[PDB]
């Protein structure tokens, strides 16, 4: 219960404000078409998993 509370508090006080990070803009010809269909010009260098 204490853990759910600290999660809730840590979310209630998540005063983060995203600024644009390092971001690639790959030349389109280098990307396999399946990736090109997904990508929209730029993307963060720190693409996460998905």
């Amino acid at each position: 219960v204490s853990g759910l509370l600290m999660v809730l508090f840590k979310v209630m006080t998540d005063n983060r404000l995203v600024i644009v990070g390092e971001t690639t803009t790959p030349m389109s010809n280098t990307l396999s078409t399946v990736v090109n269909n997904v990508l929209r010009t730029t993307y963060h260098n720190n693409v996460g998993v998905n």
């Binding site: 030349m27 010809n29 280098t30 990307l31 396999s32 078409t33 399946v34 990736v35």
Partner: protein, 99 residues
């Protein structure tokens, strides 16, 4: 099988080696449209200065310019009448799709 490969991008090394094996054994014809390339046209005396293994053709990144070389064998003088017969056979894998 006239297999057309529009894009090699996700293709596994296993599958690529296997497709090449099918080209050699089942006599597949595998057109590969992904590749962009330049073509120096060699003359028989200058030989083939550069080389391209099938592995590299199946695994080179898209958007890189491949530099293939193609011999014009037209200026190859006839063999001496007394040269020993060739028991073997010269072969070839890479061809252009276009002039």
């Amino acid at each position: 099988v006239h297999m057309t490969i529009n894009e090699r991008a996700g293709m596994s090394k296993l599958v690529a080696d296997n497709i090449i094996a099918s080209v050699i054994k089942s006599n597949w014809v595998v057109d590969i449209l992904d590749i962009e390339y330049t073509a120096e046209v060699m003359t028989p005396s200058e030989g083939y200065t550069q080389h391209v293994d099938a592995e590299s053709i199946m695994t080179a990144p898209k958007g890189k310019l491949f530099h293939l070389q193609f011999m014009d064998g037209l200026l190859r003088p006839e063999p001496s009448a007394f040269d020993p017969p060739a028991s073997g056979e010269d072969m070839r894998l890479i061809y252009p799709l276009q002039p």
